[PDB]
Design an enzyme around this catalytic site. Structure first.
Site, PDB file in Angstrom:
ATOM      1  N   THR A  40       0.861  -1.165   0.000  1.00 38.85           N
ATOM      2  CA  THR A  40       0.000   0.000   0.000  1.00 38.85           C
ATOM      3  C   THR A  40       0.909   1.229   0.000  1.00 38.85           C
ATOM      4  O   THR A  40       2.135   1.108  -0.124  1.00 38.85           O
ATOM      5  CB  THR A  40      -0.867   0.049   1.293  1.00 38.85           C
ATOM      6  OG1 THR A  40      -0.009   0.186   2.440  1.00 38.85           O
ATOM      7  CG2 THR A  40      -1.670  -1.261   1.507  1.00 38.85           C
ATOM      8  N   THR A  85      -1.447  -3.472  19.665  1.00 42.22           N
ATOM      9  CA  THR A  85      -1.112  -2.152  20.205  1.00 42.22           C
ATOM     10  C   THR A  85      -1.741  -1.866  21.537  1.00 42.22           C
ATOM     11  O   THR A  85      -2.826  -2.451  21.871  1.00 42.22           O
ATOM     12  CB  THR A  85      -1.557  -1.102  19.176  1.00 42.22           C
ATOM     13  OG1 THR A  85      -1.455   0.237  19.698  1.00 42.22           O
ATOM     14  CG2 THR A  85      -3.000  -1.227  18.822  1.00 42.22           C
ATOM     15  N   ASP A  86      -1.121  -0.935  22.265  1.00 42.25           N
ATOM     16  CA  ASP A  86      -1.681  -0.455  23.565  1.00 42.25           C
ATOM     17  C   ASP A  86      -2.988   0.296  23.409  1.00 42.25           C
ATOM     18  O   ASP A  86      -3.741   0.433  24.387  1.00 42.25           O
ATOM     19  CB  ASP A  86      -0.680   0.373  24.380  1.00 42.25           C
ATOM     20  CG  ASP A  86      -0.213   1.638  23.704  1.00 42.25           C
ATOM     21  OD1 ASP A  86      -0.541   1.954  22.545  1.00 42.25           O
ATOM     22  OD2 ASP A  86       0.554   2.427  24.315  1.00 42.25           O
ATOM     23  N   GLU A  87      -3.289   0.762  22.197  1.00 37.70           N
ATOM     24  CA  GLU A  87      -4.499   1.548  21.992  1.00 37.70           C
ATOM     25  C   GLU A  87      -5.815   0.739  22.161  1.00 37.70           C
ATOM     26  O   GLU A  87      -6.886   1.341  22.305  1.00 37.70           O
ATOM     27  CB  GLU A  87      -4.497   2.280  20.668  1.00 37.70           C
ATOM     28  CG  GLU A  87      -3.241   3.078  20.364  1.00 37.70           C
ATOM     29  CD  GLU A  87      -3.385   4.131  19.262  1.00 37.70           C
ATOM     30  OE1 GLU A  87      -2.423   4.911  19.072  1.00 37.70           O
ATOM     31  OE2 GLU A  87      -4.435   4.265  18.651  1.00 37.70           O
ATOM     32  N   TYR A 125      -9.366   2.844  13.751  1.00 39.13           N
ATOM     33  CA  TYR A 125      -8.105   2.107  13.830  1.00 39.13           C
ATOM     34  C   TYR A 125      -8.007   1.236  15.066  1.00 39.13           C
ATOM     35  O   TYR A 125      -7.800   0.031  14.940  1.00 39.13           O
ATOM     36  CB  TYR A 125      -6.858   3.008  13.769  1.00 39.13           C
ATOM     37  CG  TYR A 125      -5.602   2.268  14.173  1.00 39.13           C
ATOM     38  CD1 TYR A 125      -5.085   1.231  13.406  1.00 39.13           C
ATOM     39  CD2 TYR A 125      -4.956   2.576  15.339  1.00 39.13           C
ATOM     40  CE1 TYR A 125      -3.927   0.534  13.792  1.00 39.13           C
ATOM     41  CE2 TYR A 125      -3.825   1.892  15.764  1.00 39.13           C
ATOM     42  CZ  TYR A 125      -3.282   0.848  14.971  1.00 39.13           C
ATOM     43  OH  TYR A 125      -2.175   0.158  15.438  1.00 39.13           O
ATOM     44  N   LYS A 129      -8.290  -3.010  15.428  1.00 42.55           N
ATOM     45  CA  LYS A 129      -7.211  -3.780  16.054  1.00 42.55           C
ATOM     46  C   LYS A 129      -7.761  -4.618  17.259  1.00 42.55           C
ATOM     47  O   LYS A 129      -7.468  -5.828  17.366  1.00 42.55           O
ATOM     48  CB  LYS A 129      -6.041  -2.915  16.517  1.00 42.55           C
ATOM     49  CG  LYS A 129      -5.119  -2.296  15.384  1.00 42.55           C
ATOM     50  CD  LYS A 129      -4.416  -3.319  14.523  1.00 42.55           C
ATOM     51  CE  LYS A 129      -3.445  -4.181  15.298  1.00 42.55           C
ATOM     52  NZ  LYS A 129      -2.607  -5.054  14.391  1.00 42.55           N
TER      53      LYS A 129
HETATM   54  N1  LIG Z   1       3.736   1.894  14.759  1.00 41.85           N
HETATM   55  C1  LIG Z   1       3.469   1.623  16.038  1.00 41.85           C
HETATM   56  O1  LIG Z   1       3.898   2.467  17.027  1.00 41.85           O
HETATM   57  C2  LIG Z   1       2.642   0.453  16.501  1.00 41.85           C
HETATM   58  C3  LIG Z   1       2.764  -0.008  17.836  1.00 41.85           C
HETATM   59  C4  LIG Z   1       2.326  -1.303  18.161  1.00 41.85           C
HETATM   60  C5  LIG Z   1       1.865  -2.138  17.164  1.00 41.85           C
HETATM   61  N2  LIG Z   1       1.618  -1.600  15.923  1.00 41.85           N
HETATM   62  C6  LIG Z   1       1.124  -2.558  14.976  1.00 41.85           C
HETATM   63  O2  LIG Z   1       2.303  -3.063  14.341  1.00 41.85           O
HETATM   64  C7  LIG Z   1       1.967  -3.393  13.021  1.00 41.85           C
HETATM   65  C8  LIG Z   1       2.866  -2.670  12.029  1.00 41.85           C
HETATM   66  O3  LIG Z   1       2.726  -1.285  12.163  1.00 41.85           O
HETATM   67  P1  LIG Z   1       3.646  -0.314  11.312  1.00 41.85           P
HETATM   68  O4  LIG Z   1       3.797   0.932  12.083  1.00 41.85           O
HETATM   69  O5  LIG Z   1       4.897  -0.978  10.818  1.00 41.85           O
HETATM   70  O6  LIG Z   1       2.657   0.010  10.046  1.00 41.85           O
HETATM   71  P2  LIG Z   1       3.010   0.596   8.596  1.00 41.85           P
HETATM   72  O7  LIG Z   1       1.866   1.485   8.200  1.00 41.85           O
HETATM   73  O8  LIG Z   1       4.415   1.173   8.535  1.00 41.85           O
HETATM   74  O9  LIG Z   1       3.071  -0.760   7.684  1.00 41.85           O
HETATM   75  C9  LIG Z   1       1.902  -1.495   7.295  1.00 41.85           C
HETATM   76  C10 LIG Z   1       2.308  -2.585   6.285  1.00 41.85           C
HETATM   77  O10 LIG Z   1       1.208  -3.440   6.075  1.00 41.85           O
HETATM   78  C11 LIG Z   1       1.021  -3.616   4.675  1.00 41.85           C
HETATM   79  N3  LIG Z   1      -0.385  -3.915   4.379  1.00 41.85           N
HETATM   80  C12 LIG Z   1      -1.500  -3.106   4.582  1.00 41.85           C
HETATM   81  N4  LIG Z   1      -2.624  -3.753   4.214  1.00 41.85           N
HETATM   82  C13 LIG Z   1      -2.257  -5.022   3.840  1.00 41.85           C
HETATM   83  C14 LIG Z   1      -2.986  -6.135   3.379  1.00 41.85           C
HETATM   84  N5  LIG Z   1      -4.350  -6.157   3.352  1.00 41.85           N
HETATM   85  N6  LIG Z   1      -2.315  -7.291   3.028  1.00 41.85           N
HETATM   86  C15 LIG Z   1      -0.954  -7.324   3.135  1.00 41.85           C
HETATM   87  N7  LIG Z   1      -0.235  -6.246   3.574  1.00 41.85           N
HETATM   88  C16 LIG Z   1      -0.865  -5.106   3.934  1.00 41.85           C
HETATM   89  C17 LIG Z   1       1.512  -2.332   4.074  1.00 41.85           C
HETATM   90  O11 LIG Z   1       1.800  -2.521   2.699  1.00 41.85           O
HETATM   91  C18 LIG Z   1       2.700  -1.972   4.940  1.00 41.85           C
HETATM   92  O12 LIG Z   1       3.954  -2.512   4.468  1.00 41.85           O
HETATM   93  C19 LIG Z   1       0.451  -3.085  12.883  1.00 41.85           C
HETATM   94  O13 LIG Z   1      -0.303  -4.290  13.088  1.00 41.85           O
HETATM   95  C20 LIG Z   1       0.145  -2.079  13.941  1.00 41.85           C
HETATM   96  O14 LIG Z   1      -1.189  -2.173  14.427  1.00 41.85           O
HETATM   97  C21 LIG Z   1       2.052  -0.351  15.554  1.00 41.85           C
HETATM   98  C1  LIG Z   2       1.146  13.244  12.931  1.00 43.22           C
HETATM   99  C2  LIG Z   2       1.076  14.100  14.182  1.00 43.22           C
HETATM  100  C3  LIG Z   2       0.735  13.574  15.383  1.00 43.22           C
HETATM  101  N1  LIG Z   2       0.653  14.380  16.457  1.00 43.22           N
HETATM  102  C4  LIG Z   2       0.294  13.793  17.739  1.00 43.22           C
HETATM  103  C5  LIG Z   2      -0.932  12.880  17.768  1.00 43.22           C
HETATM  104  C6  LIG Z   2      -0.535  11.860  18.846  1.00 43.22           C
HETATM  105  O1  LIG Z   2      -0.887  12.286  20.204  1.00 43.22           O
HETATM  106  C7  LIG Z   2       1.006  11.789  18.759  1.00 43.22           C
HETATM  107  C8  LIG Z   2       1.442  10.597  17.925  1.00 43.22           C
HETATM  108  O2  LIG Z   2       0.706  10.609  16.706  1.00 43.22           O
HETATM  109  P1  LIG Z   2       0.788   9.370  15.678  1.00 43.22           P
HETATM  110  O3  LIG Z   2       2.177   9.295  15.095  1.00 43.22           O
HETATM  111  O4  LIG Z   2      -0.351   9.541  14.712  1.00 43.22           O
HETATM  112  O5  LIG Z   2       0.709   8.031  16.564  1.00 43.22           O
HETATM  113  P2  LIG Z   2      -0.518   7.456  17.465  1.00 43.22           P
HETATM  114  O6  LIG Z   2      -1.875   8.000  17.117  1.00 43.22           O
HETATM  115  O7  LIG Z   2      -0.121   7.613  18.873  1.00 43.22           O
HETATM  116  O8  LIG Z   2      -0.435   5.904  17.041  1.00 43.22           O
HETATM  117  C9  LIG Z   2       0.854   5.312  16.845  1.00 43.22           C
HETATM  118  O9  LIG Z   2       1.141   4.502  17.970  1.00 43.22           O
HETATM  119  C10 LIG Z   2       0.155   3.467  18.201  1.00 43.22           C
HETATM  120  C11 LIG Z   2       0.156   2.508  17.027  1.00 43.22           C
HETATM  121  O10 LIG Z   2      -0.809   1.480  17.258  1.00 43.22           O
HETATM  122  C12 LIG Z   2      -0.158   3.288  15.756  1.00 43.22           C
HETATM  123  O11 LIG Z   2      -0.130   2.389  14.622  1.00 43.22           O
HETATM  124  C13 LIG Z   2       0.844   4.442  15.599  1.00 43.22           C
HETATM  125  O12 LIG Z   2       0.465   5.207  14.460  1.00 43.22           O
HETATM  126  O13 LIG Z   2       1.431  13.012  18.162  1.00 43.22           O
HETATM  127  C14 LIG Z   2       0.978  15.689  16.401  1.00 43.22           C
HETATM  128  O14 LIG Z   2       0.956  16.438  17.428  1.00 43.22           O
HETATM  129  N2  LIG Z   2       1.355  16.236  15.262  1.00 43.22           N
HETATM  130  C15 LIG Z   2       1.409  15.512  14.129  1.00 43.22           C
HETATM  131  O15 LIG Z   2       1.767  16.013  13.043  1.00 43.22           O
END
Ligand SMILES: NC(=O)c1ccc[n+]([C@@H]2O[C@H](COP(=O)([O-])OP(=O)(O)OC[C@H]3O[C@@H](n4cnc5c(N)ncnc54)[C@H](O)[C@@H]3O)[C@@H](O)[C@H]2O)c1
Ligand SMILES: Cc1cn([C@H]2C[C@H](O)[C@@H](COP(=O)(O)OP(=O)(O)O[C@H]3OC[C@@H](O)[C@H](O)[C@H]3O)O2)c(=O)[nH]c1=O
Ligand SMILES: NC(=O)c1ccc[n+]([C@@H]2O[C@H](COP(=O)([O-])OP(=O)(O)OC[C@H]3O[C@@H](n4cnc5c(N)ncnc54)[C@H](O)[C@@H]3O)[C@@H](O)[C@H]2O)c1
Lengths: 346, 346
Positions: B39, B124-126, B160, B164
């Protein structure tokens, strides 16, 4: 407060009871039933009351175009449509994913678009399981020994899982988008018009057909029985007087184990106490359910009227006896389906 | 190293690609097949160096049952990262969240059941909702219930976080009902290299590098619990290889900070004035404070985080985005234009 409501799943057991309730007690309200007529939907549940107050539209809650056309003309949705059977969900989860999760989502998006009222009908099964009363320090009456609105979600099966998932997106659509939604979680219903795959009607109609009743394992499991008529009034109270975003629990303090229910059916129908078969037990079977309905009672003044289970069961047995043409065409098929995965324990 | 042929879904994104590199560098007996739809968030460049005999990238959807079956038939474990991951996109268009996060997880679970293979669900913690700030808590963040534990109630806020949470619920039901060999992890906010520039930290860093003002939602009092992706990778490895079947483990590094303070640190480290940013339109339903108690993981599996100095981790992250401008420069204009559709300076 509402004049044009959509009732999804209104050709089924509990949903059709609700439609009858509105037809009888609120004749100024127009009801549009949206029902797919699966194995569990039955035009006979509504046929005699269709007219200017009640209309039937056949279709799927996941059909966004149809849902849109109906919602444009409504002021509320009361949502009963679901795949409802734990045993079916163990054999094939596919329609539970579709109907219970994707269908709820589709309905929520319509409610959001038209800014209309939405009431989500759900179950005590979202909370998982409890120990039996003999294994608890407060014998069922202490804190945490019954479900409350603060109990954690912990569902056990594809059915209860998909129901809980749907409750979660309802709550998120309230927080994120301001949808005008309420939720109810109710204990096991009984009464007229329940499909013969379910516990109470299956035993009554097996006896009427000359077939042995069937008990899962030794019958230790406990369910909290409430008459459908009392679930109808509870939902009507929440729909018209409830606080937006809130969850209400519905129950009537009616815990019984399955063995005791079956023994009461046998006795009431003139059969010997041992005239039944023990059969294969259910994978992951939930032990005890029990609802503390204090919030609904306190806040909205709802009280259940059908609290004598012996009398309620007697009237239920008589209804299945007096309406054998309503279920006879399904008996062989439902019993044959069960035979694919259940057998007599010996 | 019990597992020799694993599938990593979503392995071309931020945290999944970091996990695939961790496996390549630390477990040379493991072959990895990545399944990723590419994506807007997936990027082959996140994997390119290690693609070859040890790591294969297969482009496709976790919801394509035919493709999933062909891959699962050759594997001994699935580690599941594939998701739509951004709260803001989920408020603009929930559709792909419903499809990928819920239907996608279901499809993978049915394959794990069919082939009887190990499954680890990354979450996730959310899923637990929101907490008050420490100054408003009787224990200052240190009392029972003032951080999330494995016993905390689900209460997700957005499309979101609710999709999850819903996926977590079906995973647990597939364990109880069908004996699927699954574990679940719930982790706090990750940071580090290869994170998409729509997310908070990389957005501010790259805006500065591009000559654009950073953006803070409201006054920036919201609190997130930061963990380096490298420590998330070791946490998941521990749970995959040593976790108790059916259990949930929480992952966190005791790193709570408010958004304003993180932004100020970025500004200071990059040589910018402390007031050189814009406050912007706050997020609908915005979650206040998140915080994880990771005792269960530390005590039972012996895991400990190695990157506990946030100042130093952030310094290295800034340097990465500075040294790899070609990796993100072409996406900047489109990401900022998308945000302008719903965000204004306040
Ligand atoms: N980023 C965080 O702080 C955070 C924290 C805890 C857990 N998570 C979880 O960890 C995982 C990864 O998060 P991330 O930040 O690397 O996300 P990201 O947005 O960077 O990556 C998402 C990946 O999933 C792929 N994808 C989306 N839809 C798909 C589908 N239907 N089939 C196959 N592939 C698909 C995308 O192509 C992409 O490579 C998620 O499950 C998210 O809920 C995220
Ligand atoms: C993009 C953006 C975010 N924010 C704030 C919103 C949130 O309180 C904090 C973090 O924002 P995000 O990066 O959107 O993260 P969050 O909503 O906390 O979720 C992230 O952590 C939990 C994970 O599950 C999720 O996938 C990941 O996107 O910063 C800002 O103040 N300014 C910004 O431009
Ligand atoms: N029966 C109980 O003890 C109990 C207790 C509390 C809550 N509930 C909930 O009450 C609701 C109704 O349960 P019930 O026992 O009447 O179920 P039921 O099986 O008797 O009826 C289900 C109805 O939904 C319809 N339906 C199924 N899929 C549909 C779809 N995709 N689109 C439109 N209609 C569809 C069927 O045709 C049928 O008329 C369910 O949401 C259930 O979870 C049941």
């Amino acid at each position: 407060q509402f004049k044009n409501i959509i009732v999804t799943g209104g050709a089924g057991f509990i949903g059709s009871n609700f439609v009858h309730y509105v037809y009888n007690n609120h004749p100024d309200v127009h009801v549009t039933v949206l029902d797919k007529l699966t194995y569990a939907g039955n035009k006979a549940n509504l046929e005699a009351i269709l007219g200017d107050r009640v209309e039937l539209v056949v279709g799927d809650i996941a059909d966004a175009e149809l849902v849109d056309k109906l919602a444009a003309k409504a002021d509320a949705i009361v949502h009963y449509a679901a795949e409802s059977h734990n045993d079916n969900s163990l054999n094939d989860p596919s329609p539970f994913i579709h109907t219970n999760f994707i269908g709820t989502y589709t309905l929520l998006e319509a409610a959001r678009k038209y800014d209309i009222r939405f009431h989500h009908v759900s179950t005590d099964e979202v909370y998982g399981d409890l120990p039996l009363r003999e294994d608890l320090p407060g014998h069922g009456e202490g804190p945490g020994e019954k479900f409350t609105a603060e109990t954690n979600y912990n569902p056990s099966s594809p059915y209860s899982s998909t129901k809980a998932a749907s409750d979660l997106i309802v709550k998120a659509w309230v927080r994120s988008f301001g949808v005008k939604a309420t939720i109810s979680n109710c204990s096991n219903n009984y009464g007229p018009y329940q499909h013969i795959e379910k516990f109470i009607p299956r035993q009554i109609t097996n006896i009427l057909a000359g077939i042995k009743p069937k008990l899962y394992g030794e019958g230790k499991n406990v369910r909290d029985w409430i008459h459908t008529n009392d679930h109808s009034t509870g939902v009507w109270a929440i729909l018209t007087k409830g606080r937006m975003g809130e969850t209400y629990l519905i129950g009537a303090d009616g815990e019984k184990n399955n063995k005791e229910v079956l023994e009461l059916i046998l006795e009431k129908m003139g059969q010997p106490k041992d005239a039944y078969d023990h059969v294969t037990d259910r994978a992951g079977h939930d032990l005890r359910y029990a609802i503390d309905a204090s919030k609904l009672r306190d806040e909205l003044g709802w009280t259940p009227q059908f609290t004598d289970f012996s009398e309620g069961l007697e009237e239920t047995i008589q209804w299945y006896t007096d309406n054998q043409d309503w279920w006879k065409a399904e008996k062989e098929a439902v019993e044959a389906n069960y035979a694919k995965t259940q057998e007599v324990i010996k």
